[PDB]
Amino acid sequence: YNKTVSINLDSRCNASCDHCCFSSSPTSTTRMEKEYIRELVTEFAKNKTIQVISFTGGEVFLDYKFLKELMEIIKPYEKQITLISNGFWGLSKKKVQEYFHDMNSLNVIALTISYDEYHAPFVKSSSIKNILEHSRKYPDIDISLNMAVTKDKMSNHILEELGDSILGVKITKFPMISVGAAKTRIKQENIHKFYSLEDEDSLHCPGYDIVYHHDGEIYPCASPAIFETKITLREEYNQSFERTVEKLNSNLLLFILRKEGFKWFLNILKENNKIEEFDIPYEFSSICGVCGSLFNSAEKINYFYPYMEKYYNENF
């Protein structure tokens, strides 16, 4: 898990999407300091094993001067960069031309644009179209469109209104994780259910990807669900990436999760009649929804401690 790293630059956003896992908005104040982020980026650029550095938010193009400065710190080290954005900056074709020129010159290998019925009140369809159309001039930047959907807001008209600008662009529609604004602003019956507490053989985490988050903590993946858990990899303010990687690889809970899957934790809760007490829902839109419900409090994580200690003694 030491070839990729991500930094969440800010919780601030121009949009206020009703599903947002971070409840991002123009008035969000959670963020690491700029100088601290410059130090993280410099360290990641100098690191010999990191190949990709990804930026997310919040909206990373909101303070473009700062994003460009960070990409310029990485440039002499030739690391690959990925960006994700709501594409608000697409409104002006001249701006789109400037940003694609910079992304091309700064080794940005992927740009993901999010557009759907939740983002639509904040960004015009023309802005998204301008970005997607201009991307054809930069075939080495992998362009994708992310569409967050619910049963009542499936983004069918959104895709039709993008017209031919989406031709050649990989589109993925995905359901909601019940975190952040999605917990209170979306009816739970409108969130698709694909998994249940019974299909335990398909309950496996897809893998870890280190994220240095805007709350100043470090998380083992970039799923919306993880940020409401108490699973953090930070032990001190000035912690190296070597130490973050070592902690991830020696975390007993994450080791058991990787090796045994969610059924190991779910069976303990079932045998001890803790499913209702810990508010574990019966159905979920994603395996991450199971993850988030198991570990979103210190009580829940600490409940598993004697079981994980017994697992360590029997297998190590």
């Binding site: 991500s6 969440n8 990804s54 994700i84 994708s144 993925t172 995905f174 919306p224």
Partner: peptide
């Protein structure tokens, strides 16, 4: 979006 561990990236 492809695998959940890189969902917001």
């Amino acid at each position: 979006k492809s695998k959940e561990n890189r969902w917001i990236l």
